Tab-separated table of C-alpha atoms in Angstrom:
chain	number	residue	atom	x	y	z
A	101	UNK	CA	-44.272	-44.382	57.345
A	102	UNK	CA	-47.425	-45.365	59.840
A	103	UNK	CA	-45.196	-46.803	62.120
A	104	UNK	CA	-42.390	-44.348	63.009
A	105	UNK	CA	-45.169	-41.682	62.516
A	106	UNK	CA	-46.156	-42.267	66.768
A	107	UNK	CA	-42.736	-42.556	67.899
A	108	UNK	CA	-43.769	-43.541	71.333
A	109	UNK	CA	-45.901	-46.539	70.432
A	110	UNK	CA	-43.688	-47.623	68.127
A	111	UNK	CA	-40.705	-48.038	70.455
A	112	UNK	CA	-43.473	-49.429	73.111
A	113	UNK	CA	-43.694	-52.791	71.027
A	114	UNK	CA	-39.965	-52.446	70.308
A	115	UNK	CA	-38.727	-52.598	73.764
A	116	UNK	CA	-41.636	-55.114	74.961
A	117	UNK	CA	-40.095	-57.505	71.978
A	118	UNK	CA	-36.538	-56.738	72.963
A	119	UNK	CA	-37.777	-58.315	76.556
A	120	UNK	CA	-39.026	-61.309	75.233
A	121	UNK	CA	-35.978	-62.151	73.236
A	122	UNK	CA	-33.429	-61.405	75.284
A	123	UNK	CA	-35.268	-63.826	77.578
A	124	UNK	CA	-35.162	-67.203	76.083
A	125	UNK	CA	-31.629	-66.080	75.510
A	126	UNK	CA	-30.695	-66.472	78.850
A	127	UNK	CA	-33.094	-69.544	79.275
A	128	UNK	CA	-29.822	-71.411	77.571
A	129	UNK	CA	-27.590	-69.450	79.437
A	130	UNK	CA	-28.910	-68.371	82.619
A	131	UNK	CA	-26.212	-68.118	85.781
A	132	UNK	CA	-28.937	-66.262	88.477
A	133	UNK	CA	-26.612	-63.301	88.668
A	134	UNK	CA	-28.659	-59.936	88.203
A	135	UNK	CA	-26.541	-59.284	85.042
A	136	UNK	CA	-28.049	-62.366	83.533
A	137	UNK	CA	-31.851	-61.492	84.981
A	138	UNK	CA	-32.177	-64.031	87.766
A	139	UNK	CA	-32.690	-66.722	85.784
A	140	UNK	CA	-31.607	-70.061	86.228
A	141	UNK	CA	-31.899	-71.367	82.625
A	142	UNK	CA	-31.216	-74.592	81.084
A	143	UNK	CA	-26.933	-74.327	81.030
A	144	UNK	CA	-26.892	-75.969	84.603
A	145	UNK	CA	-30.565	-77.035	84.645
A	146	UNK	CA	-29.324	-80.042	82.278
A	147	UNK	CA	-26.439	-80.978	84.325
A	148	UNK	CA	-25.633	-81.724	87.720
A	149	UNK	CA	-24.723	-78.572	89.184
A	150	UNK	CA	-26.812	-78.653	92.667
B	2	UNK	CA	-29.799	-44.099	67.748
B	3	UNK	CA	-32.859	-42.395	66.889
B	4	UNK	CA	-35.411	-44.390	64.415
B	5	UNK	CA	-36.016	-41.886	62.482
B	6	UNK	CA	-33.196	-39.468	62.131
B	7	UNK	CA	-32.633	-40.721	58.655
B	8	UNK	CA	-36.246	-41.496	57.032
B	9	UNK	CA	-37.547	-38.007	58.359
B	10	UNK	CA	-37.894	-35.891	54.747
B	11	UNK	CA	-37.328	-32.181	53.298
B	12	UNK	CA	-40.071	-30.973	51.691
B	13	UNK	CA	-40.776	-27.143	50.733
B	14	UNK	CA	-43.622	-24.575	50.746
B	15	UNK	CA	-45.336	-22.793	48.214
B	16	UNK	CA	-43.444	-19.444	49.266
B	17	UNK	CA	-41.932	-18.182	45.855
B	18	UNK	CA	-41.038	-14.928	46.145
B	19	UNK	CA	-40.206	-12.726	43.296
B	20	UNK	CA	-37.210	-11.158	43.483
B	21	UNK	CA	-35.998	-9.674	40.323
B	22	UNK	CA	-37.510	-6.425	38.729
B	23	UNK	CA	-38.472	-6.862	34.756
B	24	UNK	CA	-41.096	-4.274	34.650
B	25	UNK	CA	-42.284	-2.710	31.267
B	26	UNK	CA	-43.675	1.327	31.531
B	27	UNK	CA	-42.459	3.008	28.584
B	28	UNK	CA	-43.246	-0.180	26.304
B	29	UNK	CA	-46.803	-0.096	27.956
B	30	UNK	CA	-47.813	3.030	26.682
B	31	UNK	CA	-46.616	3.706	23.218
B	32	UNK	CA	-49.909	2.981	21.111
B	33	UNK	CA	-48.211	-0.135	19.291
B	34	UNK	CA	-48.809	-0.568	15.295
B	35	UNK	CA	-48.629	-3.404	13.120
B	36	UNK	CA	-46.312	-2.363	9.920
B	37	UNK	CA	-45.868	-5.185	7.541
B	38	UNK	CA	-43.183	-3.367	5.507
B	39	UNK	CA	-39.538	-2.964	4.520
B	40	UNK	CA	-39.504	0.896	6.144
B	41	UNK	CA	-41.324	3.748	6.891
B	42	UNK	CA	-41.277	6.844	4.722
B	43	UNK	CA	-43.284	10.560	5.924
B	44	UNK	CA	-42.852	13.742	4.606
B	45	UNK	CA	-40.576	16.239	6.718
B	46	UNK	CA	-41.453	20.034	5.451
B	47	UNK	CA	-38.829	22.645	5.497
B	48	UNK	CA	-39.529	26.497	4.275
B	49	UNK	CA	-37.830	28.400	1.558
B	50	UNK	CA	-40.341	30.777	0.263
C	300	UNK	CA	-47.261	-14.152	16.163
C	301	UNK	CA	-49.773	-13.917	18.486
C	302	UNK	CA	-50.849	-11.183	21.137
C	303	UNK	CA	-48.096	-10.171	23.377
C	304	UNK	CA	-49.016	-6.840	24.602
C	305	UNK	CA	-49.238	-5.700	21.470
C	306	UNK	CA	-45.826	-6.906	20.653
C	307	UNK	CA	-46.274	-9.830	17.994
C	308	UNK	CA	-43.751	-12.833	19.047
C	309	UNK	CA	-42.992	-16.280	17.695
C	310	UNK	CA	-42.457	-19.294	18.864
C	311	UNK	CA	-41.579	-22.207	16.409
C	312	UNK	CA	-40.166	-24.760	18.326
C	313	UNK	CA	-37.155	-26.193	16.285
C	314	UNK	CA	-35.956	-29.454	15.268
C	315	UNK	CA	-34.670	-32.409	17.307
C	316	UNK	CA	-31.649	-34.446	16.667
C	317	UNK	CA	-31.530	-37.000	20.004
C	318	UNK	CA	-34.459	-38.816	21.551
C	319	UNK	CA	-34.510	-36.400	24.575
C	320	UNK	CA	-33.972	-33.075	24.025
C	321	UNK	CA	-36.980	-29.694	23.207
C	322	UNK	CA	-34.884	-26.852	22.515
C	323	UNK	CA	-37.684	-23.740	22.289
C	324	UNK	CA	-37.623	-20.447	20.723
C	325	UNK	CA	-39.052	-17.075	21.119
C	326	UNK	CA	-38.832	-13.922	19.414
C	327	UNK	CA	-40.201	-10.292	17.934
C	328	UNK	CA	-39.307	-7.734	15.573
C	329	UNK	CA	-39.246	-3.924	16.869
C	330	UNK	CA	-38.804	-0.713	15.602
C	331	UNK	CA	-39.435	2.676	17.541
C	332	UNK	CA	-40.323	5.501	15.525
C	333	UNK	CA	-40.797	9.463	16.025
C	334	UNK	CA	-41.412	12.069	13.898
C	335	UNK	CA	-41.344	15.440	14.197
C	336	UNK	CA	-38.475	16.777	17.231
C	337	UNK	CA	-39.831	20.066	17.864
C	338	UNK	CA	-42.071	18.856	20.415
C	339	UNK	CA	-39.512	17.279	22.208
C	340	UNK	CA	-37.390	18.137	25.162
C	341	UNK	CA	-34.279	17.028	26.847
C	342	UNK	CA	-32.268	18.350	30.159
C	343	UNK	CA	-28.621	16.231	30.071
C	344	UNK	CA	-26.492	15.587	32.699
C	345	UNK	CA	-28.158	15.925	36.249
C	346	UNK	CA	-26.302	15.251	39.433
C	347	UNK	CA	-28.167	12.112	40.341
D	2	UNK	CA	-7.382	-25.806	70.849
D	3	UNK	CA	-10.388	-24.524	68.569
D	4	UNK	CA	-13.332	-23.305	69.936
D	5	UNK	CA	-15.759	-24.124	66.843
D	6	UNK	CA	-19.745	-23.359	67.187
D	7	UNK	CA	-22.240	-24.587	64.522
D	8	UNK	CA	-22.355	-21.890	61.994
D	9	UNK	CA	-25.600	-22.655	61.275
D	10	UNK	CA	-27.406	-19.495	62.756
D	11	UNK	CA	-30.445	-20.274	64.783
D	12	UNK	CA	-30.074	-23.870	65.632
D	13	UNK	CA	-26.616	-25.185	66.542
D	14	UNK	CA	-27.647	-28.326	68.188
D	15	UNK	CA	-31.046	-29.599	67.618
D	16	UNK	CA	-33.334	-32.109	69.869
D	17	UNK	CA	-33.424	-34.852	66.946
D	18	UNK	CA	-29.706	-34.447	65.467
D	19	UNK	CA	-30.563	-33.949	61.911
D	20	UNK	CA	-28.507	-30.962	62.020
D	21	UNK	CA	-29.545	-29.435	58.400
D	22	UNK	CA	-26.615	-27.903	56.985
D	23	UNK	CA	-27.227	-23.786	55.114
D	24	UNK	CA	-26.535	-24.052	51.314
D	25	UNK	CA	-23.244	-23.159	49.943
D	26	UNK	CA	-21.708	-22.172	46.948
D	27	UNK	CA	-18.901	-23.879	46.393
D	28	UNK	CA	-16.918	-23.256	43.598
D	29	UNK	CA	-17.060	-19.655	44.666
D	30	UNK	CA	-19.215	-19.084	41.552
D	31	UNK	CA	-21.538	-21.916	40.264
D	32	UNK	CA	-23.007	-24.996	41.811
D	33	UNK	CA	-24.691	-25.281	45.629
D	34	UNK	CA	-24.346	-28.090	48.118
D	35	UNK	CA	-27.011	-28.489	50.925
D	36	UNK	CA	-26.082	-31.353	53.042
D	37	UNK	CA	-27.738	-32.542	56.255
D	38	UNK	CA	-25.778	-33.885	59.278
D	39	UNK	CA	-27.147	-36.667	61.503
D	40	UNK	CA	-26.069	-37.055	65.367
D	41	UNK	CA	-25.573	-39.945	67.233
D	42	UNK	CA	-26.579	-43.298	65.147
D	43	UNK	CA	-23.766	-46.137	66.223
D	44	UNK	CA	-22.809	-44.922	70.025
D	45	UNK	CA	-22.982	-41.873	71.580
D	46	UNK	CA	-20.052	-39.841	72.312
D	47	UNK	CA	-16.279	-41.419	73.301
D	48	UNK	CA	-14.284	-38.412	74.050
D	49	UNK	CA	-12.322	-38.350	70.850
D	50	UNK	CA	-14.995	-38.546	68.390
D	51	UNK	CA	-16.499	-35.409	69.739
D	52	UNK	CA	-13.035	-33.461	68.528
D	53	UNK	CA	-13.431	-35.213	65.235
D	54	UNK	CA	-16.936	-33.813	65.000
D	55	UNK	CA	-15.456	-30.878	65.946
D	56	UNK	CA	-13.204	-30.580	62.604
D	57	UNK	CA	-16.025	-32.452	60.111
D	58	UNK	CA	-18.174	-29.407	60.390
D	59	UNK	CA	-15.297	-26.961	60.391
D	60	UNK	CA	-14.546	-28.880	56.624
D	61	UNK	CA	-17.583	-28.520	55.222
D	62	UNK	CA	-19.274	-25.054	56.726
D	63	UNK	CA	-16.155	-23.138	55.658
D	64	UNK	CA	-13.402	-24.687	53.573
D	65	UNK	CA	-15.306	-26.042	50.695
D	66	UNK	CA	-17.338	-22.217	50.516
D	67	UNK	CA	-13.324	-21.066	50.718
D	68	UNK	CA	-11.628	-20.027	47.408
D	69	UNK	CA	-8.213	-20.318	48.104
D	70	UNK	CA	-9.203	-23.464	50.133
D	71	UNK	CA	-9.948	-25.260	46.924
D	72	UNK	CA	-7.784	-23.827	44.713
D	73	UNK	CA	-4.720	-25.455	47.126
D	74	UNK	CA	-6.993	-28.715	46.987
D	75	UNK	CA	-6.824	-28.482	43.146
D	76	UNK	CA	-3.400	-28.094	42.829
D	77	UNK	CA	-2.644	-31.370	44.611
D	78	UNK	CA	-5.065	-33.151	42.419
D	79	UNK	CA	-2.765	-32.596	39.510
D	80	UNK	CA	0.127	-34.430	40.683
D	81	UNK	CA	2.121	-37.399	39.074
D	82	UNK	CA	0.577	-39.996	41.508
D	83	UNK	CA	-2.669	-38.795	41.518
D	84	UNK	CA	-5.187	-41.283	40.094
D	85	UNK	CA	-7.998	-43.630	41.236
D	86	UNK	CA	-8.823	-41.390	44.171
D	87	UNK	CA	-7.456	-43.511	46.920
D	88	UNK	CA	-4.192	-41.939	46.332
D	89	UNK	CA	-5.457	-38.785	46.092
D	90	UNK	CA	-6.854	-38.634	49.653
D	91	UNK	CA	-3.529	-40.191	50.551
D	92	UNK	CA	-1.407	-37.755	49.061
D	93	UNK	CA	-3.211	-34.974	51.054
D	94	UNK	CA	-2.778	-36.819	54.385
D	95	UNK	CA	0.885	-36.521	53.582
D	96	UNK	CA	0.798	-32.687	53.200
D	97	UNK	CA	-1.003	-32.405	56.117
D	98	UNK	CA	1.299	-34.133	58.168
E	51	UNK	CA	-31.651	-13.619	28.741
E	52	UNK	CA	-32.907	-11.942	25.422
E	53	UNK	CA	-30.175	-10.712	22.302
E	54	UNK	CA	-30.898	-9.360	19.383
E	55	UNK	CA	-29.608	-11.903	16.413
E	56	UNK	CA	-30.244	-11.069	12.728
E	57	UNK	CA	-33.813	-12.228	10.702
E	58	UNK	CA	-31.444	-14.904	9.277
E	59	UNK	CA	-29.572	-15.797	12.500
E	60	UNK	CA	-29.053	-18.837	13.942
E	61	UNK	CA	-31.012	-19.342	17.413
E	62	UNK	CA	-29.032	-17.654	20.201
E	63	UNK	CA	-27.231	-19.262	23.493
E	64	UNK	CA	-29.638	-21.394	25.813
E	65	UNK	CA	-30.441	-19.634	29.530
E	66	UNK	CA	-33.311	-20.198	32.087
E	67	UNK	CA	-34.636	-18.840	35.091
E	68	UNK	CA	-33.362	-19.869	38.880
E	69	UNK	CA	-34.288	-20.179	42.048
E	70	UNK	CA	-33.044	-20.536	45.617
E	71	UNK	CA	-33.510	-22.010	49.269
E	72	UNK	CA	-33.689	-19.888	52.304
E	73	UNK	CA	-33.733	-23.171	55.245
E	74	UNK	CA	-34.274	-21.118	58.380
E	75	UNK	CA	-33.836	-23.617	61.437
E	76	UNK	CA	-35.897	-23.349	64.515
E	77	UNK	CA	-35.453	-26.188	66.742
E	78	UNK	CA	-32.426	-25.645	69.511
E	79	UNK	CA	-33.622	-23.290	72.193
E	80	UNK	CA	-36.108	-22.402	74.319
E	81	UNK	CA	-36.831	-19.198	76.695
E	82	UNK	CA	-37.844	-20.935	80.088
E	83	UNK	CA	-38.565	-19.695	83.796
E	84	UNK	CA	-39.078	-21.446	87.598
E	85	UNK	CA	-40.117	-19.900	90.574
E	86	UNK	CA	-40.485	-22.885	93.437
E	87	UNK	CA	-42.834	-21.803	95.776
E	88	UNK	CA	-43.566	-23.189	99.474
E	89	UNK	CA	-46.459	-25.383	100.212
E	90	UNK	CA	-46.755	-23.412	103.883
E	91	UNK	CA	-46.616	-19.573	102.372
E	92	UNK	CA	-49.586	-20.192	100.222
E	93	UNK	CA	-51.671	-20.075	104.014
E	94	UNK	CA	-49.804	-16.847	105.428
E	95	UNK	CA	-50.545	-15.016	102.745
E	96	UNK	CA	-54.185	-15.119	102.586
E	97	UNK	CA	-54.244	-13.398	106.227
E	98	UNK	CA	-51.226	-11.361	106.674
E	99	UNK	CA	-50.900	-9.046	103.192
E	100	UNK	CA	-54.049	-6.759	102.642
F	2	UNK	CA	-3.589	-35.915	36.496
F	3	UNK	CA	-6.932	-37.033	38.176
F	4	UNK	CA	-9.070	-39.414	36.962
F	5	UNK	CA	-12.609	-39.195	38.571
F	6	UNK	CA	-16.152	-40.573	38.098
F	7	UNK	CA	-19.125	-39.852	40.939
F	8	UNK	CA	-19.008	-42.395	42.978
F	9	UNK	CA	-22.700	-43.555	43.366
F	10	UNK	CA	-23.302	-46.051	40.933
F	11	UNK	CA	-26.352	-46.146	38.687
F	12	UNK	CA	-26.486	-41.886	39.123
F	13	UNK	CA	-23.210	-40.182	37.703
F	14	UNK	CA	-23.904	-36.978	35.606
F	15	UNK	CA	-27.897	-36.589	36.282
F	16	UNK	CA	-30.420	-34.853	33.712
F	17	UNK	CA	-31.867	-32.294	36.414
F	18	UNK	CA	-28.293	-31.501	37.579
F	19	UNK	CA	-28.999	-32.409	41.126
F	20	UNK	CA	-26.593	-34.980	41.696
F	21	UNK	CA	-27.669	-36.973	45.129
F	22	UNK	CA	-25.231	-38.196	46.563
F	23	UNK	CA	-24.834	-41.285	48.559
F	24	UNK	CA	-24.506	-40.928	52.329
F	25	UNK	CA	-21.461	-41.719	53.972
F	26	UNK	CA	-20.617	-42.546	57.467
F	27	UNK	CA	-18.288	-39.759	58.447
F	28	UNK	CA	-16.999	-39.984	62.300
F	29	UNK	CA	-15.419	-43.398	61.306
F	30	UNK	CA	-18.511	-44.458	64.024
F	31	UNK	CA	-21.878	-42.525	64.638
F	32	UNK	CA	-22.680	-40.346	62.050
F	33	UNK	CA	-24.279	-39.584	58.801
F	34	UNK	CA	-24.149	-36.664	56.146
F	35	UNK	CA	-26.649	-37.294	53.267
F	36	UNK	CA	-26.117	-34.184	51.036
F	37	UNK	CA	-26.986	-33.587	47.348
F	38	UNK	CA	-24.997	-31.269	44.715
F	39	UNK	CA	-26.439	-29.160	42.532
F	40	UNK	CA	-25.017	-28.283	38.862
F	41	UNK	CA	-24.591	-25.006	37.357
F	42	UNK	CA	-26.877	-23.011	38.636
F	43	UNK	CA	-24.897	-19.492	38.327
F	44	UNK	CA	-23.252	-19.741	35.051
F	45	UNK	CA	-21.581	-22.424	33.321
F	46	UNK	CA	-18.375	-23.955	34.780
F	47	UNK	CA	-15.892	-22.785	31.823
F	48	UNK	CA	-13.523	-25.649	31.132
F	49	UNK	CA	-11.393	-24.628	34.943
F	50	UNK	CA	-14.396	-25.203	37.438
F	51	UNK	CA	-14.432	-28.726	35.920
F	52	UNK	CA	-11.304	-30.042	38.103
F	53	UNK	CA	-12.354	-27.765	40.937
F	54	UNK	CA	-15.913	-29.862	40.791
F	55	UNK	CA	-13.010	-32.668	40.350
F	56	UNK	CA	-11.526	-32.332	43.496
F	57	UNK	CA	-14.663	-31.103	46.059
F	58	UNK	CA	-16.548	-34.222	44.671
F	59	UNK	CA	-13.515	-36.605	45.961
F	60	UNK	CA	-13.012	-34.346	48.866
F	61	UNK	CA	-16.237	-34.922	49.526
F	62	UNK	CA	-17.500	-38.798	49.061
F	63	UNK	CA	-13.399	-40.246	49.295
F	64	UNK	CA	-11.993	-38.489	51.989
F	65	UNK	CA	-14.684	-37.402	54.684
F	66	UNK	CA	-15.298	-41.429	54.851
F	67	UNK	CA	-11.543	-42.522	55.337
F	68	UNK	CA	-10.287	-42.716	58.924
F	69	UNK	CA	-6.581	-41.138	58.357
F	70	UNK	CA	-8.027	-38.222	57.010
F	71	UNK	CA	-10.466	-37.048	59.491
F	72	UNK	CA	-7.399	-37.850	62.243
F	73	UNK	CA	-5.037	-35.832	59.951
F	74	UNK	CA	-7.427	-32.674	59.490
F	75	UNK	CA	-8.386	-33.617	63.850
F	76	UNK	CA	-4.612	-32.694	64.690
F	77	UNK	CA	-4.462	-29.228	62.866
F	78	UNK	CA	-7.560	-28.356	64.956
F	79	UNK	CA	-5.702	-29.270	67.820
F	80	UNK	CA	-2.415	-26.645	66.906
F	81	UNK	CA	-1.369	-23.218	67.933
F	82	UNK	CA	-3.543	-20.667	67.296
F	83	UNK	CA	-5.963	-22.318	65.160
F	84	UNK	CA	-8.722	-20.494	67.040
F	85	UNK	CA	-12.217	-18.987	64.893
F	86	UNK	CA	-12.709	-21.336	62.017
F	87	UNK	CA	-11.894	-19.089	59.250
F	88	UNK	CA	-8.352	-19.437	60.310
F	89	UNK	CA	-8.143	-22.971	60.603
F	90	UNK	CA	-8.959	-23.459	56.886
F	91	UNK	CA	-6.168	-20.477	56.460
F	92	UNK	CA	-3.711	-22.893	58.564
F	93	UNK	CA	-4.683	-25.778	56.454
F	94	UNK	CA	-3.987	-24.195	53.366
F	95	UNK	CA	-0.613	-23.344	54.202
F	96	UNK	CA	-0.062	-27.296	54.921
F	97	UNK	CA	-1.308	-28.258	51.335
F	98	UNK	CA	1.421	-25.800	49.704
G	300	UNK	CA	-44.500	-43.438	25.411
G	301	UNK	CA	-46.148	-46.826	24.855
G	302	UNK	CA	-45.611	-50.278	27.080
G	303	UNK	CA	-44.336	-52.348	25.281
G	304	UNK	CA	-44.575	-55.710	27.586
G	305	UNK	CA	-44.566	-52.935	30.459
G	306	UNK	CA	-41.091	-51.377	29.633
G	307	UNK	CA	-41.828	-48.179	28.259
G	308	UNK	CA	-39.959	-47.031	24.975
G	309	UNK	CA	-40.423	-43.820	22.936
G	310	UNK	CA	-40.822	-43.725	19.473
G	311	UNK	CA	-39.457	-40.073	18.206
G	312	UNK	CA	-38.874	-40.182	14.655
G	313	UNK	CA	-36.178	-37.556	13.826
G	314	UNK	CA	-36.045	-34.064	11.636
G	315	UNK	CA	-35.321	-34.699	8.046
G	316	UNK	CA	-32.644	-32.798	5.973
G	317	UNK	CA	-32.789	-34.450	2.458
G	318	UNK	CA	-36.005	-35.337	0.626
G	319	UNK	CA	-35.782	-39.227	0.481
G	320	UNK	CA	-34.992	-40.288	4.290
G	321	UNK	CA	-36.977	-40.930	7.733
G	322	UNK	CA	-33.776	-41.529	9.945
G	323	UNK	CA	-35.662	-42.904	13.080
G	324	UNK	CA	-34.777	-44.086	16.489
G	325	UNK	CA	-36.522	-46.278	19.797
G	326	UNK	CA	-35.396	-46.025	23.565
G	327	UNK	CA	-35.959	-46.737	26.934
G	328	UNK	CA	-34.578	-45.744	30.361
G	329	UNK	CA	-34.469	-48.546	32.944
G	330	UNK	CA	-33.258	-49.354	36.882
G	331	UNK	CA	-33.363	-52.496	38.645
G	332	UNK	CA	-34.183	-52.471	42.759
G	333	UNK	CA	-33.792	-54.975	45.128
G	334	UNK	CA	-34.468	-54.460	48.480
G	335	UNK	CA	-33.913	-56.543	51.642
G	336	UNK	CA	-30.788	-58.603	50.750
G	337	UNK	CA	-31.910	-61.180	53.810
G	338	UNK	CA	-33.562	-64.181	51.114
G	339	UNK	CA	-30.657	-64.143	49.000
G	340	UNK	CA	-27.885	-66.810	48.354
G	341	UNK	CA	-25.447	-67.410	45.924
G	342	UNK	CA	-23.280	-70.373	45.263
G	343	UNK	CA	-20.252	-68.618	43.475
G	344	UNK	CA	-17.227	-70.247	41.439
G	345	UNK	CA	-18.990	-73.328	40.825
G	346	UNK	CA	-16.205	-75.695	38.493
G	347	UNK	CA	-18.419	-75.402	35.187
């Protein structure tokens, strides 16, 4: 295959698209601890929680 | 987990190497004939004079 | 029969009986022949 | 304790993990095998599973080249429970226990 | 294989030829050396050895 | 008495002889084999290396898969002086008599 | 082997033995492959 020919540019858009969707995975369940990436996310940003 | 330790493929080289020993001398020097017949009959001449 | 070194061989392939199957053949006819042993020679057993 | 090395000559443990397996004979006469053996594909190592690695390769380097190895492993083939071969691989745990 | 069968025989026993792998792995080791020079040596040695 | 067929599906007794066989997952976890079998290749297999190819093909596909087999053949490996693995298949043989 | 509808089938008439007979035969040799099982659904045991 073309794609796992380079192995380092194919696991360079691999990792770059795990990023983005393990990111709008914690915009639904974001807590601001550094486990959950400092986000704040929509869990307590759609109720009244401070 | 490496993505491709399992679509990575075998594939050979033209290497053969011959091995066994079917050689031919004898054969390959004993000025062959073509007899089309049932046997072959000389004369063989003894003394007795 | 052909060629073969100046060996004459055949080859005929045969008949078939299934849809997949060949089954070759290939074969000559010899015969040495030497006349007259009082030319010839022979030492026997050598310890090799 | 067992102190197992791969037998494969030049090349025990690679960089990639597709440790090829050498080509064996294995009914001590007529047929060949050549397997391959890939590393690490659901986890990496936990402790145990590096023992059981430990005895897969000891299974299949040696014991199936083995003649008296598989001559034992016929004989349990032919017993009186020995179909459908579930049961067969459970009637060898058995023995081995 | 090659018999000898009579004029009227009947087609002897069925053989071919073989061949065989040889594999030869390369890829474990490696024959590898350091030395870890000094940043300061490399000026006293250009005058103090002759 | 054994009853057997290959085990991958659509490919049981192969024209070429070179019977691929399906790869298993072998560690119960993390690993792979992959291997192929070749037919006769150094004879014929004369009507008693049939149930020998029997019993290494279920040896093979049925039992390096299960999970109560590799932990069976693990503690053997871990006995007493089961030490340079042409003895361990000689103290595994003794188990399956 | 022709394509018949793009199967392909071999025709292979056989050897004779006696003089009035043709004795003929027709094959093919097939696989179906399906990869990707991520589109498929099935509705199973449906109370026909």
């Amino acid at each position: 295959n073309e794609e796992l020919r380079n192995l380092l540019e194919a696991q360079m858009r691999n990792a770059v698209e795990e990023i983005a969707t393990t990111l709008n995975k914690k915009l639904y369940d974001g807590s601001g601890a550094i486990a959950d990436g400092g986000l704040i996310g929509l869990s307590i940003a759609a109720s009244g929680q401070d | 987990a490496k993505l491709n330790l399992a679509v990575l493929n075998n594939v050979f080289s033209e290497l053969l190497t011959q091995e066994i020993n079917r050689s031919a001398t004898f054969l390959g020097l004993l000025s062959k004939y073509p007899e089309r017949k049932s046997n072959i009959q000389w004369g063989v001449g003894m003394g007795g004079t | 029969a052909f060629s073969a070194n100046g060996v004459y061989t055949l080859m005929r392939q045969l008949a078939q009986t299934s849809l997949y199957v060949d089954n070759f053949v290939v074969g000559c006819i010899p015969q040495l022949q030497l006349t007259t042993r009082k030319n010839v020679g022979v030492i026997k057993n050598i310890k090799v | 304790p067992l102190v197992y090395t791969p037998a494969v000559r030049g090349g025990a443990n690679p960089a990639s993990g597709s440790y090829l397996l050498d080509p064996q004979y294995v009914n001590s006469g007529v047929d060949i095998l050549q397997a391959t053996y890939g590393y690490n594909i659901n986890g990496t190592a936990n402790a145990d599973q590096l023992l059981q690695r430990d005895a897969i390769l000891a299974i299949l380097e040696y014991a199936l080249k083995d003649t008296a190895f598989v001559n034992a492993i016929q004989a349990v083939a032919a017993g009186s429970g020995v179909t459908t071969p579930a049961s067969f691989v459970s009637a060898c745990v058995t023995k081995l226990t | 294989t090659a018999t000898g069968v009579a004029i009227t025989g009947s087609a002897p026993a069925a053989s071919m030829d073989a061949t065989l792998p040889a594999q030869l792995p390369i890829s474990a080791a490696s024959v590898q050396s350091t030395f870890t020079l000094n940043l300061k040596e490399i000026e006293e040695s250009k005058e103090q050895v002759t």
